[PDB]
Amino acid sequence: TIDTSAQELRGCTVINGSLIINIRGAAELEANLGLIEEISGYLKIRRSYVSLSFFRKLRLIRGEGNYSFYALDNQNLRQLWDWSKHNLTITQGKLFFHNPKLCLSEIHKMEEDIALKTNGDQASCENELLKFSYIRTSFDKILLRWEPYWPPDFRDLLGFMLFYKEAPYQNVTEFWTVVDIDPPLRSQNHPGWLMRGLKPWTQYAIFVKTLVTFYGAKSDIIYVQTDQILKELEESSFRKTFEDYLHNVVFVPR
Amino acid sequence: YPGEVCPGMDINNLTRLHELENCSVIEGHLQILLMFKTRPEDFRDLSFPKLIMITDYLLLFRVYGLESLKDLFPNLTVIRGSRLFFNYALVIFEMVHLKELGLYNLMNITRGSVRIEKNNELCYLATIDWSRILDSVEDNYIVLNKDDNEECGDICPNCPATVINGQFVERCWTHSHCQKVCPTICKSHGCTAEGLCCHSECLGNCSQPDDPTKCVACRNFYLDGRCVETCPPPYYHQDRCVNFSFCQDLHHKCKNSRCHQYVIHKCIPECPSGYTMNSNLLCTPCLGPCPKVCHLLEGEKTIDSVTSAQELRGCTVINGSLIINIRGGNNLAAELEANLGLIEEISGYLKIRRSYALVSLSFFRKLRLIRGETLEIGNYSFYALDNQNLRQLWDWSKHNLTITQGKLFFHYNPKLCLSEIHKMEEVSGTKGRQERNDIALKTNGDQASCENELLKFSYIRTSFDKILLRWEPYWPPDFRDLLGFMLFYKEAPYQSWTVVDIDPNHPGWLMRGLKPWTQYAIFVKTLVGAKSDIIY
Amino acid sequence: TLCGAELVDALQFVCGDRGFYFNTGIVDECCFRSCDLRRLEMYCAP
Amino acid sequence: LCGAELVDALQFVCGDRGFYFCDLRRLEMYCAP
């Protein structure tokens, strides 16, 4: 329960008390709340105004209306534990999820009384992917390219978001230096981006995602080695509606 | 007004253009578009100086071969704008190989706005002062042009510059002509060649000062080549007025065949509510409640602009849906009230889609009750999908509304709190019908602050080292639902947003950090909300 | 699925020189769904 | 991309295409094939 309380524990492996933590607004809490392996009690998730990365391993939860996994309303909970190496062995307890930005994948991969409509109201997780092509590296800058993804409505896509951050080890999570790239023109030159000066002989993790209105696709994380949006969305929707109205008025069927 | 009156035609080729070489005033809307197999070499041969007045608007869309509007409408001065094209009076969409706007004779616009989009060859709007022509300024939509995409030349032809944002910026229409400058005294009657003010009855430029009979546009009414505020009673009012003979001829030309029957009230094509027509032509008083029923084609009808609700004035009962979906930052709080002001009975569900500019619904003054004969899926009579900016719904203090049909939908309303929904349900009486409604208690009220409580505040004298202050811990009226208090303190500016949570005798709060002759703003909010006062 | 300005452009491929008619919508039938040449044929003037 | 680094910024865009005479859309065609 911090806004300190969990700092006095630090080096603890067995927890005999309930969790009523209410931290709200990851790196700062990793130093202290990053050495938890066994929990014997009640776990509750309060308001968290990014990801539940505090429990690095969480090998075993003892547990003991008999609820052990409670999640309340959140304002910044977009993701969850990495479901590639982390393992959960919760035996005694139930499941209860409130988490509006929690995508459907985190719920479907759980198998590795809960409301369905309320959970994941705005699931901003992409299903498709864009494989990287034409990868060229230099001593100072790296140029990348990707295949163009065109939705049925070409005006829906507002551009591209590019993510990049230094990562000496091959373990990067989406949880920055995001750069916006304007959408290309329909024709067929493949979209691409050239970066600025970077540290030589440093591993870099790069992945690109697309932004669309009320769809889209995101590219997988790739590793390389060297040697106010609401107003814009409203304006785009207004322009699209005006164009549709003009097309309907001008074009009349027989 | 030398010339006839064009009834209004829509323009493939240039053959259908000779109708514009004779008439001087077009009684409708001029639309020149879909001109593909044209070349600029064969375009510089036709001129229409007679066209000075446009009744509704001017629309241009993909006119190949067009270079400038100087040889098209040299004398275009004023536009009445009685009927708009998507709340606009001058639309230029997908212009092709245009260089500059040739409408140097334009002085003022009565109604509507100007939108220019997709102009990859024209960039001259930076040196145009769009302030003395149309009153509306934020309603303009000037994007996707060559001005912000390329640094093209902006040369100018002696006229004084205009300051609206910065230093002296020259204003011009084309390369050989510039914007006309009128004195501040000539507010709306225009200025002559010498700049002297004339009579306040002629729109645009006036040939001679104090000469209402010598002008090319009439501000209020035109009659016998003269500008008058109101024509004599023998002459009856399309906003000019004509005699009874013209109205009789128009009426006779509608009963024979084909309709917009013309009556006398003025010569509006529809009598107002509460009146009936009989075989003189004046709108005689009606006996017994007779509503002005306005049937809606196809059933459900969507409203997205001013022109969408334009054909709804005076309607009492609507046989269809009234879904409202208006996008953009243009707040149409005046046009909607003028149009949707006489609506009293609605025979269908009321739907409110995503509307950023719909800050409030304070325009259905005469709305008594809403029927549900034509319902939708889910048995919903009042549907609300997303209201990003809606701080108010209705003034239930003086307005009474009742609902006698199925449930209502209210979701995704960050700016609307639960108090307004509860008041609406209590007034409509739906909660008294024992029905399962649809109100969200999470997505509604999160971004809204409706305290509906006036707590006291006992302030104790502070100190230089630290500020000590206590507040009354108002207990909840039902059990103990209090979760604590939130306190904000940023600064006390002239007449971020860190918060501190205190668990629930006055608890009080202590803060550190004081400066000489400085003021701090302290206020608290309860959670179940409450507020006492804003101080500095 | 054709939307935007290119949607008009395909019309120039269809009519060619026949022009356009003088006197729901085209977007809801061609942009929001799938339409063929037969569906939009009559949109040009005879 | 102002003044001096234009040459070696363009050199790694279109490859062997040297030149044709402050994203890539203004860089791919700014060289001679």
What tokens appear for B281 in the block?
Answer: 């032509």
CB-nearest to C5 from B13, B34, B94 is B94
Residue B33 has phi, psi (to 5 degrees) of -165, 170
Q: Which residue in B255, B309, B305 sits closest to B277, CA to CA?
A: B255
CA dist., res. B231 & res. B201, Å (int): 13
| B chain contacts of residue A235, beta-carbon cutoff 8 Å | 143, 328-329
Q: What CATH superfamily classification does B451-536 receive?
A: Immunoglobulins (2.60.40.10)
Q: Would you say C44 and C21 are in contact if contact means Cβ atoms under 8 Å apart?
A: yes
Q: Using CA atoms, how far apart are residues B36 and B18, in angstroms rounded to an integer?
A: 19
CB contact set of B65 (below 8 Å; sequence gap of 6+) = B35, B38, B39, B40, B42, B43, B96, B97
Question: Can you tell me which residue has the tokens 């046989």?
Answer: B319
Q: Give the list of residues 6+ apart from residue A190 with CB closer than 8 angstroms, or none.
A: A133, A134, A145, A146, A147, A148
| CA geometry: angle B187, B188, B191, nearest 5 deg | 80
Q: Residue A19: left (phi > 0), alpha (psi -120 to 50), or beta? A: beta
- Residues sharing a CB contact under 8 Å with residue A78, sequence separation 6 or more, in sequence order: A50, A51, A101, A102, A103, A124
Runs of H (alpha helix) within chain A? 27-30, 104-108, 229-250
Structure tokens at B113: 């706005």
Asked if A65 and A91 count as a contact pair (C-beta separation under 8 A), the reply is: no
First to last CA, chain C: 25
Both tokens of residue A129? 């992917």
CB B387 within 8 A of CB B352: yes
Helix/strand/coil for B420: helix
Give the C-alpha separation, A8 to A17, whole Å. Answer: 14
**Amino acid code (one letter) for B495:** Q
Residues B69 and A214: their CA atoms lie apart, in Å, by: 39
End-to-end CA distance of chain A: 69
Are B65 and B43 spatial neighbours (Cβ–Cβ below 8 Å)? yes
Give me the numbers of helices (H) and strands (E) for chain C, helices first please: 3, 0
Task: Please answer whether residues B317 and B293 qualify as being in contact, where contact means their C-beta atoms are separated by less than 8 angstroms.
Answer: yes
Resolution (A): 3.2
| Mode of pairing for the β-strands spanning B293-295 and B317-319 | parallel
Closest Cα in chain B, distance from residue C1 (Å): 21
Amino acid at residue number B260: H
* CA–CA separation, B453 and B481 (whole Å): 16
Which method resolved this structure? Answer: cryo-EM
Q: Under an 8 A CB cutoff, do D24 and A192 touch?
A: yes
Specify which residues A38 forms β-bridges with: A14, A60
Q: Exposed (0-12), middle (13-18) or buried (19+): which is D17, by Cβ within 10 Å?
A: middle
Cβ distance B33 to A118 less than 8 Å, yes or no, reads no
CA angle B386, B391, B396 (to 5 degrees): 110
| Residues of chain D contacting residue A192, judged by C-beta atoms under 8 Å apart | 23-24
**B482 residue type, one letter:** L
| CA B512/CA B505 separation, integer angstroms | 23
Q: Does C8 touch chain B (CB under 8 A)?
A: yes
CA distance B219 to B240: 10
Instruction: Indicate which of A161, A162, A194 best probes the interface with D, i.e. most D CBs within 10 Å of its own CB.
Output: A194
Structure tokens at B227: 């500008």
Closest CA to B174 of B196, B163, B159: B159
Residue written as token pair 């009640």: A42
Residues after which a C–N gap over 2.5 Å breaks chain D = 21, 22
| B94 CB within 8 Å of a chain C CB | yes
HSE (side-chain half, CA atoms, 13 Å) at B257: 0
Residue A104: strand, helix, or coil: helix
Length of chain C: 46
Alpha-carbon distance A47 to B445, whole Å?
Answer: 16
Of B474, B28, B18, B510, give the one whose Cα is nearest residue B260.
Answer: B28
Do B35 and B65 form a contact (C-beta atoms < 8 A)? yes
Q: Using only the alpha carbons of chain C, give its radius of gyration.
A: 10
Domain boundaries, chain A: 1-124, 132-227
Q: Is A194 on the interface with D (CB under 8 A)?
A: yes
CA B181, B184, B190, B194 torsion: positive or negative? negative
CB atoms within 10 A of CB B278: 8
Cβ-defined contact of B443 to A121 (cutoff 8 Å): yes
Residues of chain B with C-beta less than 8 angstroms from the C-beta of C8: 62, 94
Which among A82, A117, A74 has a CA at the least distance from the CA of A99?
Answer: A74
- Phi and psi at residue A146, in whole multiples of 5°? -150, 155
Q: Which residues pair with A160 in a beta bridge?
A: A181, A210
Q: Which of B133, B90, B131, B132 is nearest to B113 (CA)?
A: B90
* CA pair distance A149, A162, nearest whole angstrom: 15
Q: Does domain B293-439 have CATH number 3.40.50.2300?
A: no
Q: Which residues of chain A have a CB within 8 Å of the CB of C43?
A: 251-254
Residues 6+ apart with CB under 8 A from A134: A144, A145, A190, A192
Q: Do chains D and C touch (3 or more CB pairs under 8 A)?
A: no
Number of H helices, E strands in chain A: 3, 12
Taking the C-alpha atoms of residue B395 and residue B233, their distance in angstroms, rounded to an integer, is: 42
Q: Which of B61, B328, B443 sits opposite A250 (nearest CB)?
A: B61
- A192–D contact, CB cutoff 8 A: yes
Shortest CA distance from C12: residue in chain B: B36
Q: Which helix (H) or strand (E) holds B478?
A: none
Which of C5, C17, C45 has the CB atom closest to B37's CB atom? C17
Structure tokens at B316: 């009492």
Query: DSSP readout, A160-225?
Result: EEEEEEE-SSS--------EEE-------PPPEEE-----TT-EEEEEEEEEE----BBPPPEEEE
CA distance B441 to B419: 11
Interchain contact D/B (3 or more Cβ pairs less than 8 Å): no
The Cβ of residue B214 has, within 10 Å, a number of other Cβ atoms equal to 16
Q: Fill in the amino acid letter for B57.
A: Y
Q: Which residue in chain A has the smallest CA separation from B388?
A: A230
Q: Which residues contact A235 (CB under 8 A, 6 or more apart)?
A: B143, B328, B329
- Indicate the burial class of C23 (C-beta count within 10 angstroms; 0-12, 13-18, 19 or more): exposed
Residues of A in contact with D12 (CB under 8 A): 136, 138, 141, 143, 194
CA distance B248 to B251: 5
Per the CB < 8 A criterion, the answer to whether A59 and A86 are in contact is no
Which SS3 state, helix, strand or coil, does residue B68 take? Answer: strand
CA distance A176 to B524: 35
Contact at CB, D12 and A184, closer than 8 angstroms? no
B80 neighbors B204 (Cβ within 8 angstroms): no
Q: DSSP of B162-188, one letter per residue?
A: B-SSSS-B--BSSSS-B-----SS-SS
CB atoms within 10 A of CB A141: 16
Strands B466-469 and B78-79: unpaired
Chain A residues near residue D4 by CB distance under 8 angstroms: none
B110-B115-B116 Cα angle (round to 5): 140
Q: Of all helices (H) and strands (E), which one includes residue B5?
A: strand B5-6
If you search the block for the tokens 């699931």, which residue do you land on? A123
CA distance linking residue A191 with residue A184, whole number of Å:
7
H-run or E-run covering B424: helix B418-428
Say which DSSP state D8 is in.
H
Q: Which of B284, B278, B353 is nearest to B322 (CA)?
A: B353
Interface check B207 vs C, CB under 8 A: no
- Integer Cα distance of B259 and A45 in angstroms: 67
Rounded to whole angstroms, how far apart are CA atoms B113 and B123?
Answer: 19
Contacts of residue B182, Cβ cutoff 8 Å, sequence gap at least 6: B107, B132, B190, B191, B195
Tell me, rounded to whole angstroms, the distance of Cα A97 from its chain centroid.
18
> CA-nearest residue of chain A to D23?
A193
CB B355 within 8 A of CB B326: yes
- Chain B touches chain A, with at least 3 Cβ pairs below 8 Å, answer yes
Q: Neighbours of A (≥3 Cβ pairs closer than 8 A)?
A: B, C, D
The shortest C-alpha distance from B443 to chain A (Å) reads 10
Contact of chains D and A by CB distance (3 or more pairs under 8 angstroms): yes
Task: Record the tokens describing residue A167, joined without a space.
Answer: 């990562």
Nearest by CB: C3 against A153, A248, A251? A153
Rounded CA-CA distance B325/A245 in Å is 13
Instruction: Please enumerate residues of A whose Cβ is less than 8 A from a Cβ of B.
Output: 3, 73, 118, 121, 230-231, 234-235, 237-239, 241-242, 245-246, 249-250
Could you tell me which CATH number the domain at A132-227 has? 2.60.40.10
By C-alpha distance, the chain A residue nearest D27 is A194
| HSE, side-chain direction, 13 A CA sphere, residue B181 | 10
Does this chain's domain B293-439 share its CATH topology with B451-536?
A: no
Interface contact flag, C21 A254, Cβ < 8 Å: yes
Q: List all chains that touch chain C, counting a touch as 3 or more CB pairs closer than 8 Å.
A: A, B
Look at B13 and C19 and tell me if their CB atoms are within 8 Å.
yes
Q: What is the DSSP letter of C31?
A: I
User: Which among B153, B187, B151, B186 is positioned nearest to B170, based on CA atoms?
Assistant: B153
Q: Contact at 8 Å (CB) between B363 and B341?
A: yes
B302-303 vs B323-324, strand pairing mode: parallel
Whether residue A230 lies within 8 A of chain C, CB to CB, comes out as: no
Answer whether B135's CB lies under 8 Å from B113's CB: no
Identify the three-state secondary structure at position B468.
strand
Q: B77 with B105: CB under 8 angstroms?
A: yes
Q: Which residues contact C16 (CB under 8 A, 6 or more apart)?
A: none
B155 backbone φψ class: left, alpha, beta (φ>0; ψ -120 to 50): beta
User: Is C7 in Cβ contact with A248 (below 8 Å)?
Assistant: no
Q: What length does chain A have?
A: 254
**CB neighbour list of residue A64: distance below 8 Å, 6 or more residues apart:** A40, A41, A92
B103 DSSP β-pair partners: none
Q: Report the alpha-carbon distance of residue B161 to residue B172 in Å, rounded.
A: 9
Q: Which residues of D touch A186 (CB under 8 A)?
A: none
CA–CA separation, A211 vs A125, rounded Å? 11
| Residues B10, C22: C-beta atoms closer than 8 Å | yes
Q: Describe chain A by its helix, strand, coil percentages, rounded to 5.
A: 15, 25, 65
Instruction: From chain C, pick out residues whose CB is under 8 angstroms from the CB of B34.
Output: 19-20
Q: Does A242 touch chain C (CB under 8 A)?
A: no
Burial class (CB in 10 A: 0-12, 13-18, 19+), B131: exposed
The DSSP code for A11 is: S
- CA dihedral B496→B502→B508→B512, nearest 10 degrees, is -40
Instruction: From chain A, pick out residues whose CB is under 8 angstroms from the CB of D9.
Output: 194
Residue B118 touches chain C, beta carbons under 8 Å: yes
Amino acid at A29: L
Residue with token string 């009556």: B263
Residue to substitute from A251, A252, A254, interface C, most C β-carbons within 10 A: A251
Supply angle C-alpha B336, B340, B343, rounded to 5.
165
Return the CATH fold of B1-180: 24 nucleotide stem-loop, u2 snrnp hairpin iv. U2 a'; Chain A (3.80.20)
> Which residue of A136, A138, A181 is in closest CB contact with D23?
A181
What is the residue type of C10?
A
Hey, are the CB atoms on A244 and C27 less than 8 Å from each other? yes
Find the length of chain D.
33
Q: Looking at the domain covering A1-124, what would its CATH class be?
A: alpha beta
CA angle C1, C7, C10 (to 5 degrees): 100
Question: Any residues with CB less than 8 A from the CB of A217 and at least 6 apart, and which?
Answer: A126, A127, A128, A129, A130, A149, A209, A210
> Are B450 and B417 contacting, i.e. CB atoms less than 8 angstroms apart?
yes
- The candidate with the shortest Cα–Cα distance to A141, out of A190, A192, A212, is A192
Interface of B with A (CB under 8 A): 33-34, 61, 85-86, 91, 93, 117, 143, 304-305, 325, 327-329, 354, 356, 388, 442-443, 500-501
Which are the contacts of B236, defined by CB distance < 8 A and separation ≥ 6?
A: B242, B243, B244, B247, B264, B266, B267
* CA–CA separation, B93 and A216 (whole Å): 28
Rounded to whole angstroms, how far apart are CA atoms C25 and A253?
Answer: 9
Query: Contact B498/B488 with Cβ under 8 angstroms?
Result: yes
Structure tokens at B495: 């007449």
Residue contact D12–A141, C-beta within 8 A: yes
Interface membership of C20 toward B (CB under 8 Å): yes
Q: Inter-chain contact A238–B61, Cβ cutoff 8 Å?
A: no
Residue B59 exposure: Cα atoms within 13 Å on the Cβ side: 22
How far is CA B403 from its chain centroid? 29
How many residues belong to chain B?
536
CA distance D28 to D23: 10
Query: How many helices (H) does chain B have, and how many strands (E)?
Result: 4, 32
Alpha-carbon distance of A77 to A84, in angstroms, equals: 19
